[PDB]
Design an enzyme around this catalytic site. Structure first.
Site, PDB file in Angstrom:
ATOM      1  CB  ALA A  60      -7.560  18.870  -3.183  1.00 53.10           C
TER       2      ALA A  60
ATOM      3  CD  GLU B 221     -13.192  -4.490 -15.342  1.00 54.06           C
ATOM      4  OE1 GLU B 221     -12.769  -4.719 -14.232  1.00 54.06           O
ATOM      5  OE2 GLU B 221     -13.442  -5.353 -16.226  1.00 54.06           O
TER       6      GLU B 221
ATOM      7  CB  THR C 261      -1.042   0.174   1.215  1.00 55.16           C
ATOM      8  OG1 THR C 261      -1.809   1.239   1.099  1.00 55.16           O
ATOM      9  CG2 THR C 261      -0.336   0.063   2.491  1.00 55.16           C
TER      10      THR C 261
ATOM     11  CE1 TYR D  15      -8.264  11.728  -8.793  1.00 57.02           C
ATOM     12  CE2 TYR D  15      -9.537  13.013 -10.016  1.00 57.02           C
ATOM     13  CZ  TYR D  15      -8.807  12.114  -9.974  1.00 57.02           C
ATOM     14  OH  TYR D  15      -8.238  11.645 -11.240  1.00 57.02           O
TER      15      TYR D  15
HETATM   16  N1  NAP Z   1     -10.258   6.048 -15.088  1.00 54.87           N
HETATM   17  C1  NAP Z   1     -10.393   7.497 -15.527  1.00 54.87           C
HETATM   18  O1  NAP Z   1     -11.653   7.805 -16.311  1.00 54.87           O
HETATM   19  C2  NAP Z   1      -9.457   8.658 -15.447  1.00 54.87           C
HETATM   20  C3  NAP Z   1      -9.626   9.685 -16.091  1.00 54.87           C
HETATM   21  C4  NAP Z   1      -8.596  10.587 -15.964  1.00 54.87           C
HETATM   22  C5  NAP Z   1      -7.470  10.366 -15.071  1.00 54.87           C
HETATM   23  N2  NAP Z   1      -7.420   9.146 -14.426  1.00 54.87           N
HETATM   24  C6  NAP Z   1      -6.045   8.741 -13.657  1.00 54.87           C
HETATM   25  O2  NAP Z   1      -5.295   7.833 -14.007  1.00 54.87           O
HETATM   26  C7  NAP Z   1      -4.884   7.003 -13.240  1.00 54.87           C
HETATM   27  C8  NAP Z   1      -5.196   5.454 -13.225  1.00 54.87           C
HETATM   28  O3  NAP Z   1      -6.833   5.532 -12.824  1.00 54.87           O
HETATM   29  P1  NAP Z   1      -7.563   3.843 -13.174  1.00 54.87           P
HETATM   30  O4  NAP Z   1      -8.895   4.270 -13.683  1.00 54.87           O
HETATM   31  O5  NAP Z   1      -6.697   3.188 -13.974  1.00 54.87           O
HETATM   32  O6  NAP Z   1      -7.667   3.342 -11.657  1.00 54.87           O
HETATM   33  P2  NAP Z   1      -7.998   1.786 -11.374  1.00 54.87           P
HETATM   34  O7  NAP Z   1      -8.448   1.087 -12.836  1.00 54.87           O
HETATM   35  O8  NAP Z   1      -9.065   1.842 -10.203  1.00 54.87           O
HETATM   36  O9  NAP Z   1      -6.530   1.424 -10.961  1.00 54.87           O
HETATM   37  C9  NAP Z   1      -6.145   1.804  -9.571  1.00 54.87           C
HETATM   38  C10 NAP Z   1      -4.780   1.078  -9.171  1.00 54.87           C
HETATM   39  O10 NAP Z   1      -4.169   1.733  -8.074  1.00 54.87           O
HETATM   40  C11 NAP Z   1      -4.142   0.591  -7.164  1.00 54.87           C
HETATM   41  N3  NAP Z   1      -4.197   1.140  -5.897  1.00 54.87           N
HETATM   42  C12 NAP Z   1      -5.318   1.566  -5.074  1.00 54.87           C
HETATM   43  N4  NAP Z   1      -5.074   1.748  -3.849  1.00 54.87           N
HETATM   44  C13 NAP Z   1      -3.731   1.899  -3.540  1.00 54.87           C
HETATM   45  C14 NAP Z   1      -2.997   1.850  -2.612  1.00 54.87           C
HETATM   46  N5  NAP Z   1      -3.355   2.534  -1.421  1.00 54.87           N
HETATM   47  N6  NAP Z   1      -1.373   1.799  -2.608  1.00 54.87           N
HETATM   48  C15 NAP Z   1      -1.165   1.358  -3.817  1.00 54.87           C
HETATM   49  N7  NAP Z   1      -1.957   1.304  -5.197  1.00 54.87           N
HETATM   50  C16 NAP Z   1      -3.324   1.440  -4.806  1.00 54.87           C
HETATM   51  C17 NAP Z   1      -5.118  -0.332  -7.458  1.00 54.87           C
HETATM   52  O11 NAP Z   1      -4.558  -1.668  -7.092  1.00 54.87           O
HETATM   53  P3  NAP Z   1      -5.062  -2.449  -5.744  1.00 54.87           P
HETATM   54  O12 NAP Z   1      -6.709  -1.892  -5.634  1.00 54.87           O
HETATM   55  O13 NAP Z   1      -5.226  -4.085  -5.975  1.00 54.87           O
HETATM   56  O14 NAP Z   1      -4.481  -2.059  -4.685  1.00 54.87           O
HETATM   57  C18 NAP Z   1      -5.006  -0.429  -9.191  1.00 54.87           C
HETATM   58  O15 NAP Z   1      -4.115  -1.101  -9.651  1.00 54.87           O
HETATM   59  C19 NAP Z   1      -5.258   7.458 -11.898  1.00 54.87           C
HETATM   60  O16 NAP Z   1      -4.253   8.446 -11.805  1.00 54.87           O
HETATM   61  C20 NAP Z   1      -6.690   8.460 -12.411  1.00 54.87           C
HETATM   62  O17 NAP Z   1      -6.613   9.624 -11.311  1.00 54.87           O
HETATM   63  C21 NAP Z   1      -8.506   8.123 -14.789  1.00 54.87           C
HETATM   64  C1  7H6 Z   2     -15.600  14.430 -14.704  1.00 56.52           C
HETATM   65  C2  7H6 Z   2     -14.609  13.537 -14.346  1.00 56.52           C
HETATM   66  C3  7H6 Z   2     -14.116  13.611 -13.116  1.00 56.52           C
HETATM   67  C4  7H6 Z   2     -12.971  12.819 -12.613  1.00 56.52           C
HETATM   68  C5  7H6 Z   2     -13.111  11.188 -13.146  1.00 56.52           C
HETATM   69  C6  7H6 Z   2     -13.974  11.154 -14.296  1.00 56.52           C
HETATM   70  C7  7H6 Z   2     -13.982  12.453 -15.197  1.00 56.52           C
HETATM   71  O1  7H6 Z   2     -12.471  12.901 -15.451  1.00 56.52           O
HETATM   72  C8  7H6 Z   2     -11.857  10.638 -13.733  1.00 56.52           C
HETATM   73  C9  7H6 Z   2     -10.571  11.328 -13.517  1.00 56.52           C
HETATM   74  O2  7H6 Z   2      -9.833  10.646 -12.418  1.00 56.52           O
HETATM   75  O3  7H6 Z   2     -10.141  12.139 -13.987  1.00 56.52           O
HETATM   76  C10 7H6 Z   2     -11.686   9.087 -13.432  1.00 56.52           C
HETATM   77  C11 7H6 Z   2     -12.620   9.061 -12.098  1.00 56.52           C
HETATM   78  C12 7H6 Z   2     -13.612  10.340 -12.021  1.00 56.52           C
HETATM   79  C13 7H6 Z   2     -13.833  10.889 -10.679  1.00 56.52           C
HETATM   80  C14 7H6 Z   2     -14.924  11.762 -10.610  1.00 56.52           C
HETATM   81  C15 7H6 Z   2     -14.038   9.722  -9.492  1.00 56.52           C
END
Ligand code: NAP
Ligand code: 7H6
Ligand code: NAP
Ligand code: NAP
Ligand code: NAP
Ligand code: 7H6
Ligand code: 7H6
Ligand code: 7H6
EC number: 1.1.1.146
Lengths: 250, 248, 257, 243
Positions: free
Chosen positions: D152, D188, D59, D150
């Protein structure tokens, strides 16, 4: 014996008159129809007190806002108060800098300010008011404490300032009782009093309004010392005959 | 027992002339480590070593300067590697005078006679805490009762009583094992005092001795006057009651 | 238009109120007859400020001394201040941890202390005040910096905590619009200001004109009273113009749907 | 044959980046908390032509783990070329109330751990003249409700890593820093959490491309419209002006 008419038209200063005992004293003085100049730091709250004094029947009532950490202010204040009233009959020294119940560690600045506001400013105010009081054959009233006669823990810097009042003003009293300077000096030893500051910082507390009157009374009667506590067990042992003797002896 | 002062680490303020000097001599004759201070000192240091002083140094300066006062205790602590008895004796100069206008002298009296003693005590507290030591405050009849001609002075000595009596009771209710001794002295035959003040004046040697005895013995107060009728009446029983009473 | 009478008898908190901009703000608030409670760690210097505020005409003026490293203190400070005034109208979040321009190597303790004092405590203080602010339909004023909008070297930990204020408070601002919470949130973006601290820290490394602290402080209060979202204040008018971000206001107004 | 770390690599964009990296013949160390799903990723990486592939579970709540994770991954690969900081604490969409715990935790995992991880990697990265890749968000450049804590943490990344980027610029330190602003992506986690979502597989590639090319920023959204707006020329001016 005391008659409220003894204060009618008398020109009176009350320091630290914005809150607590000093305020009550100003109101009392007003209801006895006295000319009053109140002082404190709170420009706003002082004006509120002046308006209430006029309603209660003060011959007149003014304020001057300032801090008794400033020795210059203190000199000026007495001059300006004497102007607003056309003399001074009674100077009531009541203000204190704020103090908390605490074990003394290393806070030398608290000792210093305590000694400045609670002791030194009283000497400055005294010096400035002495010409007028010599002329009116007036009174200086010093508010002190049990903590200025007996030791209590948690209040060393305060206590040190109250002991100095006794030491300094008692010595002056004797000096006036031989140079023929006909100004009375009244040291008031008060126990706990039910003011906001005192309660919100700490025994049974005597009522603030009755306290204020006893100060005025003692001052009007030209008593050397005044005692006031919620208990008679307290008040009676606070006197000290052993001292009266030694003093009379030498 | 003159053995209690054997090899103990001691400071003596206002030790250039009068009582402070005699306190140094008596302390030298019992073989204690001493650091004396004042603003003549070396002459004092010589006589001390040649009377049996374990170590006699000095540090000159004015107790008008609070920074000096704070440093002095540290420096004197360096020079002895610790401290067992701090003796506070110095006072600013005073002439018998009707108080008229002298706010300057009032303020300086509180600074030197009262305020410096508190600064010194704050500085010495750590070393004294470890050594389970003693603070000795030299006061006066004028710190217990009133006299004309000496208002500023009386106020400063009254101030000492209020302050050090207060922290005494504080230390009891913290188990801090540092003793506090208020020395109430009548007229003494010191050089300056005689050239300022009619009454019998006690000898400076038994005085200095008496003071040290009380400090060593950890007495709350030490009384000493050329009149034994007075000494019993200078104590205040009324006060001791009220303090233990409100001790609830 | 802003009228000094708007603040009269209004109950206000000012953090970081022992020096610089916080001190000036307290003074201005006192002149206007506001109920004021100030804070910082130094009780000596705080006492000085409370005295002056009373002289200048504060309706009331108290202080409570403590560190904002302690979240317990911050959570309690608000309670005690709320008590002292019988409510709260404006919360002015001004204090920061001490920081000196230096290149970042490994100082994670500095980084964590910077997020704690500069960002986290603000959140804690806000949570604590929000109940009383809701009732008065009050205001939160958050003091930030150019370094909270653009990157500068030597002040990374600092920059990060300031940026963080923007993201967080900008987010709950939009929350309160939707939820219909009637508490305003004013984020103040300032250039170099001639506070004692700033000058001592930039003096032999940075060349620029510092805007006056007294004016600076009055602007913040005005901005906060007029319930503006952002206040800009720099000695250069070029700066104050190209600081705003329209492209961002678009993106935000777009996704509002 | 480039040695790479991927944090938060058990699923979503992290996992997809690991796959692309293996498929280009790179040495890869992955991490997350769950040992089970990490084992699965390590193998699929071996299958796709990974030069090497191992995992270390833990973690990023723990700064001791983070500090030691970079050390262990660095010894296991004998150096480091690209650090990809991608992981985040679990976050829902909710109106912020008084849950200071979530806020504190968010700055810890999402921002603070990244600094620790960076500090640890710096000697190895200086040596390889390598690259830090920080995954951020629209919500790290503009404000959205429901995500205060988040956002922030994401804003903090920008502030911090942009400052040190200008720091390394004048120290001549040859480590690139790439900040990746991503719109909605079809992970997901994201989905479970009414706009159009870009494909996770292409996004991962875009992140990897940008970091390889030492880009200061990378934008990626399922809309050509947004991406054009997200840029800030006022910022570039005063940033360069006050230089
Ligand atoms: N998804 C989107 O639409 C989106 C959009 C814009 C930006 N982002 C950014 O892109 C990145 C990836 O997001 P994602 O959607 O790929 O998320 P995700 O699929 O939920 O992946 C999260 C990863 O972080 C790990 N994690 C969770 N808690 C942790 C902890 N305490 N210590 C270490 N690892 C931990 C998880 O592993 P375990 O749960 O197995 O620990 C998992 O491998 C993030 O920086 C997110 O802010 C995502
Ligand atoms: C409007 C919008 C806000 C932020 C997010 C969706 C999108 O980019 C994505 C992000 O981390 O950038 C994934 C998770 C989500 C969060 C609201 C939980
Ligand atoms: N309350 C007791 O139980 C008790 C017992 C024994 C003796 N006494 C004595 O009675 C007197 C007043 O007691 P209290 O309880 O009435 O105190 P209080 O209620 O706290 O009032 C103190 C007064 O002094 C003013 N003041 C504070 N700092 C000042 C400064 N720097 N310069 C000028 N004025 C200043 C205050 O007004 P601002 O804050 O507006 O300046 C206030 O008017 C003191 O001499 C105290 O030692 C009280
Ligand atoms: N003598 C008495 O009858 C008598 C009676 C009751 C109580 N006492 C008390 O006993 C103590 C000793 O008095 P004493 O008669 O021995 O006095 P003293 O002979 O006049 O000695 C005064 C001492 O204080 C020093 N001193 C003066 N100003 C100083 C300053 N600003 N900073 C530091 N040191 C300073 C002097 O040294 P320098 O001149 O070299 O600076 C000198 O060593 C005093 O506390 C006094 O109040 C004395
Ligand atoms: N001056 C500028 O040029 C400038 C430019 C842009 C933004 N700003 C912003 O304006 C605000 C004030 O800046 P300034 O220059 O006026 O600051 P400052 O003069 O350094 O004042 C800082 C205040 O915060 C208090 N403080 C420091 N550490 C604290 C802690 N751990 N807990 C609680 N209080 C603490 C200080 O009092 P104690 O140390 O006694 O506690 C002091 O009252 C800051 O938010 C700063 O980012 C200033
Ligand atoms: C035992 C006792 C000690 C002193 C005080 C209470 C009481 O008389 C009163 C005084 O000023 O004399 C009022 C305030 C309080 C102080 C400890 C702050
Ligand atoms: C009656 C009496 C008054 C005080 C003093 C003499 C005596 O104790 C002594 C003292 O400090 O206690 C020494 C100096 C003197 C002062 C008047 C200057
Ligand atoms: C270029 C620049 C950077 C930031 C600061 C100066 C100026 O605004 C000011 C701020 O907080 O915004 C005051 C302190 C200083 C810091 C570098 C410590």
């Amino acid at each position: 014996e005391f008659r409220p008419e003894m204060l009618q038209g008398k020109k009176v200063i009350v320091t630290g008159a914005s809150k607590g005992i000093g305020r009550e004293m100003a109101y009392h003085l007003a209801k006895m129809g006295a000319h009053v100049v109140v002082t404190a730091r709170s420009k706003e709250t002082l004006q509120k007190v002046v308006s209430h004094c006029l309603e209660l029947g003060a011959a007149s009532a003014h304020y001057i806002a300032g801090t008794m950490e400033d020795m210059t202010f203190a000199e000026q204040f007495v001059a300006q108060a004497g102007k607003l009233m056309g003399g001074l009959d009674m100077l009531i020294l009541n203000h204190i800098t704020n103090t908390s119940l605490n074990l003394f560690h290393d806070d030398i600045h608290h000792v210093r300010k305590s000694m400045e506001v609670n002791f030194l400013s009283y000497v400055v105010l005294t010096v400035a008011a002495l010409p007028m009081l010599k002329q009116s054959n007036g009174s200086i009233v010093v508010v002190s404490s049990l903590a200025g006669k007996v030791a209590y823990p948690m209040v060393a810097a305060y206590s040190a300032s109250k002991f100095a009042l006794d030491g300094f003003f008692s010595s002056i009293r004797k000096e006036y009782s031989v140079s023929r300077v006909n100004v009375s000096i009244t040291l008031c030893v008060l126990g706990l009093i039910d003011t906001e500051t005192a309660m919100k910082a700490v025994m049974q507390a005597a009522p603030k309004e009755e306290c204020a009157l006893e100060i005025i009374k003692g001052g009007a009667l030209r008593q050397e010392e005044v005692y006031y506590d919620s208990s008679l067990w307290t008040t009676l042992l606070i006197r000290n005959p052993s001292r009266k003797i030694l003093e009379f002896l030498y």
